[PDB]
Design an enzyme around this catalytic site. Structure first.
Site, PDB file in Angstrom:
ATOM      1  N   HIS A 218       0.843  -1.193   0.000  1.00  0.00           N
ATOM      2  CA  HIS A 218       0.000   0.000   0.000  1.00  0.00           C
ATOM      3  C   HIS A 218       0.884   1.251   0.000  1.00  0.00           C
ATOM      4  CE1 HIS A 218      -3.657   2.367   1.007  1.00  0.00           C
ATOM      5  NE2 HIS A 218      -2.773   3.163   1.583  1.00  0.00           N
ATOM      6  N   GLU A 219       1.861   1.298   0.903  1.00  0.00           N
ATOM      7  CA  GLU A 219       2.753   2.446   0.964  1.00  0.00           C
ATOM      8  C   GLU A 219       3.598   2.569  -0.308  1.00  0.00           C
ATOM      9  OE1 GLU A 219       2.411   4.792   3.237  1.00  0.00           O
ATOM     10  OE2 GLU A 219       0.818   3.536   4.039  1.00  0.00           O
ATOM     11  N   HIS A 222       1.587   4.164  -3.045  1.00  0.00           N
ATOM     12  CA  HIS A 222       1.453   5.584  -2.730  1.00  0.00           C
ATOM     13  C   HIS A 222       2.760   6.291  -3.077  1.00  0.00           C
ATOM     14  CE1 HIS A 222      -0.284   8.925  -0.195  1.00  0.00           C
ATOM     15  NE2 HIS A 222      -1.392   8.341  -0.617  1.00  0.00           N
ATOM     16  N   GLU A 257      -5.984   8.313  -1.289  1.00  0.00           N
ATOM     17  CA  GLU A 257      -6.117   7.072  -0.526  1.00  0.00           C
ATOM     18  C   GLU A 257      -7.118   6.119  -1.186  1.00  0.00           C
ATOM     19  OE1 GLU A 257      -3.230   7.918   2.412  1.00  0.00           O
ATOM     20  OE2 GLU A 257      -4.209   6.151   1.542  1.00  0.00           O
TER      21      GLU A 257
END
Ligand SMILES: [Ag+]
Ligand SMILES: [Ag+]
Ligand SMILES: [Ag+]
Ligand SMILES: [Ag+]
Ligand SMILES: [Zn+2]
Length: 415
Positions: A218-219, A222, A257
């Protein structure tokens, strides 16, 4: 394969892939030991007290989902475990076709060389390098794309940090910048199997544990948006109207997000705004193409102008005409943009890992658990917590904190 060598925290520095480094733009700091686990990717097994000046104190500030422990990651054994945990997670991610694609995109995502005030000169921006101490004691400036670092005061606040430019908005102008990810492989979040329960702030203790590989992915997703300079402006949010408890509190979630999570969440960004952003970033890439064409000189004899021009041609998937002029092909742009924003999503990673995970980003935190994924007996690159032979292979039993009780220690309940 992704991390070709084993790293031990106590391995002697060689000034190449194990070295004491200093982060420019980070002000005055003492050199910290870092490990280069892959081309363009470093890991600093330390709590983050350098990226943000007013964030050097690890003790719990004055009086929410947060967790503090000023002693975490303060011993050599902990730092060694952190390093092994992070390397293991990168390998789990790389073991999937989606992760291989994502990590390849991240390595190719070199921050643009737009640091020159003269439009004919191509130059690196100091926000995108680290100073590496060599065996002779001198420093060596090195470009990098990603740095995994320990969390700051709030242990569970995982997030990307990057240094700003006086005028350039590097994470939103197509240039991109080096990303520092505060993350820990030693803690994970609990969530509930039932959607109705997981999205309610008063129910559930957090029976299932999130696979930390999903959290890191996820990071990384991003981070890659920021590396390609196409992150959605944080002032663009979704005034949740699909969750009665969010509306009640007037809570809002950034488009960034929702896009990173994917699945149904991304559909909350209406078609008009979706095109708006795409058009915006399409134009930014055109700007990069023009700058490259206008470049007649380069700084730092570490590569030729021809070489760097080609590096970015590859990063941005630009088209080169007979005259060697760069331009942006809409089809190619749309393809790359979609890859970075629709293919690389948390939801898709869950499909690849075959793990149980929150069904939406619009849920409520239940709890935080202490874990140890280093031992093969607890977690493997192939199955995460749901070990093959073990009686933990089916029904996601390995992520079940009640069945696999020895692998989880609940530290705090948020419900
Ligand atoms: Ag530099
Ligand atoms: Ag540099
Ligand atoms: Ag990020
Ligand atoms: Ag991040
Ligand atoms: Zn996020």
């Amino acid at each position: 394969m992704f991390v070709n060598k084993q790293f031990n925290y106590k391995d002697p520095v060689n000034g190449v892939d194990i070295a004491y480094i200093k982060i420019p733009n980070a002000g005055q700091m003492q050199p910290v030991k870092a490990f280069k686990i892959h081309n363009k990717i470093w890991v600093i097994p330390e709590r983050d007290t350098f990226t943000n000046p007013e964030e050097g104190d690890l003790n719990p500030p004055p009086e929410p989902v947060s967790y503090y422990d000023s002693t975490y990651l303060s011993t050599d054994n902990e730092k060694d475990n952190y390093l092994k945990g992070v390397t293991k997670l990168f390998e789990r991610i790389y073991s999937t076709d989606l992760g291989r694609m994502l990590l390849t995109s991240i390595v190719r995502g070199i921050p643009f060389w737009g640091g020159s005030t003269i439009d004919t000169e191509l130059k690196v921006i100091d926000t995108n390098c680290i100073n590496v101490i060599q065996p002779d004691g001198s420093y060596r400036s090195e470009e990098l794309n990603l740095v995994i670092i320990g969390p700051s005061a709030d242990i569970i606040q995982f997030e990307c940090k990057s240094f700003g430019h006086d005028v350039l908005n590097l994470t939103r102008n197509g240039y991109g910048s080096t990303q520092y990810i505060r993350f820990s492989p030693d803690f994970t979040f609990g969530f509930e199997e039932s959607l109705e329960v997981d999205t309610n702030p008063l129910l559930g203790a957090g029976k299932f544990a999130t696979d930390p590989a999903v959290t890191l992915a996820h990071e990384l997703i991003h981070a890659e948006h920021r590396l390609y300079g196409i992150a959605i402006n944080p002032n663009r949010v979704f005034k949740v109207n699909t969750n009665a408890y969010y509306e009640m509190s007037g809570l809002e979630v950034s488009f960034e997000e929702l896009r990173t999570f994917g699945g149904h969440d991304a559909k909350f960004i209406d078609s008009l705004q979706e095109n708006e952003f795409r058009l915006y970033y399409y134009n930014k890439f055109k700007d990069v193409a023009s700058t490259l064409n206008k470049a007649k000189s380069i700084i730092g004899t570490t590569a030729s102008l021809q070489y760097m021009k080609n590096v970015f041609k590859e990063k941005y998937l630009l088209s080169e005409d007979t005259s060697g002029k760069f331009s942006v092909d809409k089809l190619k742009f749309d393809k790359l943009y979609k890859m970075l924003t629709e293919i690389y999503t948390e939801d898709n990673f869950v499909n690849f890992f075959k793990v149980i995970n929150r069904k939406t980003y619009l849920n409520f935190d239940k709890a935080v658990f202490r874990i140890n994924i280093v031992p093969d007996e607890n977690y493997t690159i192939k199955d995460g917590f749901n070990l093959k032979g073990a009686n933990l292979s089916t029904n996601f039993n390995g992520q079940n904190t009640e069945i696999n009780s020895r692998n989880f220690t609940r530290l705090k309940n948020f419900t």
